[PDB]
Design a binder for these strands. Structure first.
Length: 86
RNA sequence: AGGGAACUGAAACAUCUCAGUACCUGAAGGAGAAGAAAGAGAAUUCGAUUCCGUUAGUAGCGGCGAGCGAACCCGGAUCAG
RNA sequence: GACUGUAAGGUCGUUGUUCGUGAAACGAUGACUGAAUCCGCGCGGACCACCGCGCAAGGCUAAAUACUCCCAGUGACCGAU
RNA sequence: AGUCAUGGCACCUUAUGCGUGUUAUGGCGUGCCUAUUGAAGCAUGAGCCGGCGACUUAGACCUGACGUGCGAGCUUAAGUUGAAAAACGGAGGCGGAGCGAAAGCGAGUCCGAAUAGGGCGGCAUUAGUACGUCGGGCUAGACUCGAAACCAGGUGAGCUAAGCAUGACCAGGUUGAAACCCCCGUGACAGGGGGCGGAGGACCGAACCGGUGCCUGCUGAAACAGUCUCGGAUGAGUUGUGUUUAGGAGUGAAAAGCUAACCGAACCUGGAGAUAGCUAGUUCUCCCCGAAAUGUAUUGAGGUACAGCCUCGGAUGUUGACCAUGUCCUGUAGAGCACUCACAAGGCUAAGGGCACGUAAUGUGUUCUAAACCUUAUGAAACUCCGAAGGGGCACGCGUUUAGUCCGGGAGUGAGGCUGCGAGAGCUAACUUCCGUAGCCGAGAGGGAAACAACCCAGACCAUCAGCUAAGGUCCCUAAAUGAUCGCUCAGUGGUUAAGGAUGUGUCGUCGCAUAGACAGCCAGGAGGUUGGCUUAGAAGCAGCCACCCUUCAAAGAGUGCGUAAUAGCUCACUGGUCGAGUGACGAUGCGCCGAAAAUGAUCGGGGCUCAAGUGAUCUACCGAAGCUAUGGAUUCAACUCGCGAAGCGAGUUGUCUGGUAGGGGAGCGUUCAGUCCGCGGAGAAGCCAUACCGGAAGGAGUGGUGGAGCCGACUGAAGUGCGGA
RNA sequence: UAGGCCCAGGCGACUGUUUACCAAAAUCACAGCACUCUGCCAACACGAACAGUGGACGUAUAGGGUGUGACGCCUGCCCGGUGCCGGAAGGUCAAGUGGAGCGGUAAGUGCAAGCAAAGCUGCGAAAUGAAGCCCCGGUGAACGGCGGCCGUAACUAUAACGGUCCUAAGGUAGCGAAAUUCCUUGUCGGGUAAGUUCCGACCUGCACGAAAGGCGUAACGAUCUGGGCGCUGUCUCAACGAGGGACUCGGUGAAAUUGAAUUGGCUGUAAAGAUGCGGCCUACCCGUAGCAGGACGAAAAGACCCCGUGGAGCUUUACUAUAGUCUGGCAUUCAACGUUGAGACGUGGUGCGUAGGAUAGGUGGGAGGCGAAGAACCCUGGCUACGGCUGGGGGGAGCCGCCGGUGAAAUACCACCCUCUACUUUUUGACGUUGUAACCUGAAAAAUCACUUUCGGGGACCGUGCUUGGCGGGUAGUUUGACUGGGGCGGUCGCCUCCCAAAAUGUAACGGAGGCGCCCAAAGGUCACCUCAAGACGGUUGGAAAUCGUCUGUAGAGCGCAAAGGUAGAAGGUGGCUUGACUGCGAGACUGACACGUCGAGCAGGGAGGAAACUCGGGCUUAGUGAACCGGUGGUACCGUGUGGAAGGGCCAUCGAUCAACGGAUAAAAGUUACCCCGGGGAUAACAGGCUGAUCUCCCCCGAGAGUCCAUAUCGGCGGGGAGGUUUGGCACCUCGAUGUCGGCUCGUCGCAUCCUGGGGCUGAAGAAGGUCCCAAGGGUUGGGCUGUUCGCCCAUUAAAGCGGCACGCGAGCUGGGUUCAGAACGUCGUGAGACAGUUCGGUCUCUAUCCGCUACGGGCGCAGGAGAAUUGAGGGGAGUUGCUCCU
RNA sequence: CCCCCGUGCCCAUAGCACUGUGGAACCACCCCACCCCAUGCCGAACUGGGUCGUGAAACACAGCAGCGCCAAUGAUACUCGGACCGCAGGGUCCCGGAAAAGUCGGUCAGCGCGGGGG
């Protein structure tokens, strides 16, 4: 194509955010937080990041994978009250 | 047989589908046309053309696109020089 | 009964075939090659090896398949714009 | 146009104050089709009558409901029979374990170094299949039609015309030139006079060819003219008839004119209907349900695909949404500020720069933002350690109901509007335009709103001149208390309107004060240093710059405003006194106005209102919806029995029975063809004209009339089965 | 009975053509000359067919195409570039010949891996080489340009002149607002008073000119403009009369069209242009004459336009076919002849591992090989990595097979294939040369064909076939993309950052800003230490700044390039070791209907750092991502239509497109119509309304400033509230089953804000006369010049010459007059066909009125017995302007 | 109940500054230096061996506001929702959730956790 001044005719662009696991919901190794398409492991989404926080959640099953370096993953040992078995 | 485009479709669009179709011209009987061959098949089988029955609506073809489409096994009229 | 019933493959350019032709023999043409010539010759989809079958050389073959000017008869059609 | 509505004349195929044939008039009320978001339109189609009135017909083209054949299943070709047939018939394919490129493998499977995974025999498993009508689709124009354009062939060119031939049309006048001849200034001889001559698309202009402009008139005379002005008229003139040229060529004065009244490539028979996402339409009457102009795709846009979005078969044995509650977050709105951009004032900042008699940085010194630290203390969509409504996630539990739960036959037509919620292009303007979120109209009526898609109230089974609620109203034209205290009250605003204003007004706080009976309307005091220095003519209280000290007396303004080049004059103010019971300047709710003057004629629906029936606060009740209860009756899904030895059917009852545009499941009226015809009709049916029984509508019914020979019936299948409207 | 007259400016030299029905003009049309070619049984035409003639029955001062068109003077610098001929060192071309070579097999071998004629086939090109593509030469009544920028004595001004860009060049005869000027109707002057006009010139002539020319230039052309001469009595009032239609009567009476009329209006309302709607007022009903505002008048479903993956038509190098035309190849072209190349048959014929009488890739036969065609031996000339190829002569009657050895082999005589050769024969591009068997042009038998009988003749040439290259719109099928806050030049077409997006997801946009389709053997993995810009302390080449020590440092660096988020325990910097930017997996997740991309503990193998630990699908990510057929290759048996290989296929992986129109879809493509036809259309423009109210006319706010000073006699820096809105429009709502600009006469009738009276406020107004404002209509408002004119200014008037009405009133009047329908000319342009609300010349124009309604006259009905006629009345209309003498 | 090397909870009701003090068991400096380790240079915080000395700012403890730092249901600002003034904002009431500064206080905590002592 070809363009100049006093006019312009250019497109625009975005993508799908798509958070996914919706907080206190079962667990397993869903996904959630496509802030970074590459992503990484997480085990158990505690809700980290800079400053005090961490998502009030606690709900064991499996690994997790989440977001970027932006906020925070989890990996915590603890189901919620459970700790012995299952 | 000499015979030859073409609106269409491919969502338009020169290979293409129509196809060898419209038309022209030559022949005879109300029958001419392929029909007994340097052949089809395929287990180391089967003979004279064509039609439809079933396959195969397969193989292939193919701006690799719509699309056209045998032989492998089959009926009878005929399984005669 | 009157007659006598037994003397061409090929190359290059291409049409077809289902094959828009190219990864393929096979009908044939445009100019060039009339070789083989018999355990020699035509091809199995180019060629190698072995098999299979057919042999330059010209036609006849009625019967069905496909047709519908006329003569009886026949169909859950119309009704004389 | 309407339907009802009291009357009104008639009749009474049953006195029975009950009806038949009807109308002044009242409520008001705008048609149908049908491509439309959208109207009732002037948006379009329509004078009527009679018919044609289309997605179907053959195709193992396929998927699927139901009934049936079979569980190990179902058949083509015609050969024999032959007014039916039919068994005989594995040509044959589909179902069948599968996977794999396939090979081949294997009840298990592609990966290679292979318990971990997607499909499969498998499997808490149908292994089925054929016939029929049928959901969509398919091979064909096969929903039809409306296009100019491409072709094969063929037909005249007597239309306008080139080329070929034989004949033809032209009354005169004017100009009257070259040739011929005698003479001559003339050697030769070029040249000069005229005579006759006879030339010239010359002259007027009849006939002859074709025409520059008005006119009548475009159903006019005629799908075609008439009146007046010209040239060709001793000629690039015209003409009778005959004739090859032609289509993708000729003719041709070139206009891109003509081939026979349109040639951007003739006509007619023929090739295909050019095909068509364009667009007109696509026929009788229906019971319960129901939408998109949002996103992804496109040489793609009012084209089309699919998905959320509808109906239906099967299903999802606890998974629904709401809530009380647990728990985590998003970080708008805003605060606030200290990394971002900029913000105001002060201290200070000039490692800063220059005005400056300097001058080894210049030691000396100065002046101002300016970076910018603190303070004072600024903004914001794209600011920071803050912070929520709301919402989601699941969980605890049941209140109404299948909410949680996929595979499929088939949709729609993609191009809307408005109020609320906020921005984008934007004089925050636009039923302009982009977006999402509730509703609304595309698919349903009203009161209010003058009548009028989204606005306040409300969405229906058909019938009753039965009741109340909300809005709207309580004066009238057409319902409903000018019933109750009272202001702005007076403009007719209230019924199109504002920045700026006028000492109009019900009512809350101060003030110098008329319980010194103040000022606001007077009598008398009304001049001295200085009448101030200065621009100087004087400016002397007043053309100017600046400035305000005291005096007679108990006090009195460096002078407002008058005259004016500038004195004189009256006075802004103070003092002795004279009736003297409150004046003047703003915030606060509520009103009228100066702006708040258009064009057809008024611009609250109208009447008309200060008996405010203009607005606001109270209290009871009414008027007042097809929204709800009563009553007969429907449709439909579910819900507690019952009547079932032959196709299934419901009262008793509760919600749904909504209205429905593309659609899903579903019933029929009847005509033609066919089955059985004992048949129905001479008192004569069928053809037709009219009478209040029933039916979900469509329609079936009672009888004559007339008419002349047949005609339809139940159980059944078939058919070009049905708009007036193209 | 019949040229109107004259001067002048624009075009054409006048007779000819025709818009067959709007339009006859400066348009084409004539000899002369300009470019030629053909140059003959000719070019060319139609004809595939040549047969045919036209050409002409001709061969040239002849004909086919192209330019202007009397005659008179003249006609040019850019050949960079389109087009033509020319020249031939050479560079680019050929399908069938093209040694070798490679790719599939196969009787050899063997232990198999593995390597073999090749009277098979592809791969494969030396070479061959005719045009054309480079150039060299030219080439203008061929196309085309005829350029730009700085200054110069004049006060200034263009100014004979300076530098240079472009060069391919690079403006002169005439005219110069003339049928090339936007910008302006230019600027001075004639004509009456005067102008978008006629001219006479000037010259800063949008973008005049050399042959589709420039000017000149008489008559003549139904071409535009100026005036006048008498007139046209057109306009003012035109006036009156006639023959015929409008009315009495007899008969005939259709078509275009259409739902339906108890069919009055307002103002309002409605997809706003309502009469059946709202609310109000109003008519005794009907007939016919007449008139246009009226139904969104009629007709073909606008044909101006847009949409339509419609058609036709023309042109251009659009993609490309193609006759035709230009070139090469063999035959109807036969022996010879000067020949470079080339194949075979024939002798045969290079070969140095010692030695073998002797220096070997040879076999069967063999008992005798050579020699009067002269044989041991010698001389001697030619290519020798030192072998060899022959003659003659010197000697003339003499040299050779077998039990020899060794060598891959023992031999000659008849053969021998290989890299390889010169001819006695044959075949083959040939260049040049005689003759005669394809052929065609001039006598004789019914005379231009057909036989042509001896025909001269020249002769392999002319040419048909299939193949090739070039040209070619001569002819053909299509594209030419689309979007679209309208056509559309421009601008847009994929991915990524958000602002605005409406605190989960969460869209748009001719709303806005930054870019890209990478980097990197390392900014990758491991282990370790180190906080960055930034100020201050004064000290170096050190007139800031670069050097260092220091505290501070919500750390303000940097981490590969927008942006957001992350950022020390550093993903940050540095540095040693070294790469899993590995493979086979993978419960459970988001993304989207599909497309699928993103997450990752853990399993399997062998590895790296590393004690171990820990990490290891290149690294912060999202932008560096990225298509199916076809093809490029090694594994792969997994096979392969006869079977075994094998043309092939798939699989492992992988490479070919600024397609940067990025879901593209083909690999494959332009312009043009005002002659158009259709499909629809204001759900797809423009001319009217319309929501709106930008700009338009008018008033409001107090203080600066005029007025001697001095706000308002009158205005008002800056700005503030709106009524109207018909100022050019923003909206695309029904109008495309179609409503045709503007203006002119006339009818005009509304409104007022008042254009001229009137009575009033003031007046910085003595009068005369005004300057602004207040109030309502009572009235009324010219003629000349041009234009189509709205407008506009020029001349005089006028009490003054209005403003907003009405789709800027209206063809159911005409007019078109401009221009805006098709013709031609100019100006620049597109290559050409062609483009312009740029300029100019002409240039048909409607239509049987039932009617609503209005100007009229009648048929009647009528308030109560029937009647001729005379009457007072609501009220419906008519219903108005003004200068000037004289007089206190 | 003593002093005290130390692991968390944590994350400014433990940032800094003022007084002083303990050293012998806690902890600093140091000493010696060639060799393990081999520091951008050296071996100084990264080095092998330890009995002087001292604890000085650095190591510890309580008092300890100069400002930080936690700092409230309470009025405001903000908000699911109801009719309204009213011009969009903005605004009345009803009316729930319910910032911040400002009001005090406190700040140099506190509990398990391995010890060298009278």
């Amino acid at each position: 194509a070809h363009k100049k001044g006093v006019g312009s005719s250019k497109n625009g662009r975005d993508s799908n955010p798509k958070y996914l696991g919706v907080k206190k919901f079962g667990g397993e190794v869903v996904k959630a937080g496509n802030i970074l398409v590459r992503q990484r492991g997480t085990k158990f989404k505690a809700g980290q990041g800079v400053g005090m926080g961490r998502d009030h959640t606690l709900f064991a099953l499996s690994d997790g994978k989440v977001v970027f370096i932006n906020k925070g993953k989890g990996a915590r040992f603890i189901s919620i009250e459970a700790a012995q078995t299952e």
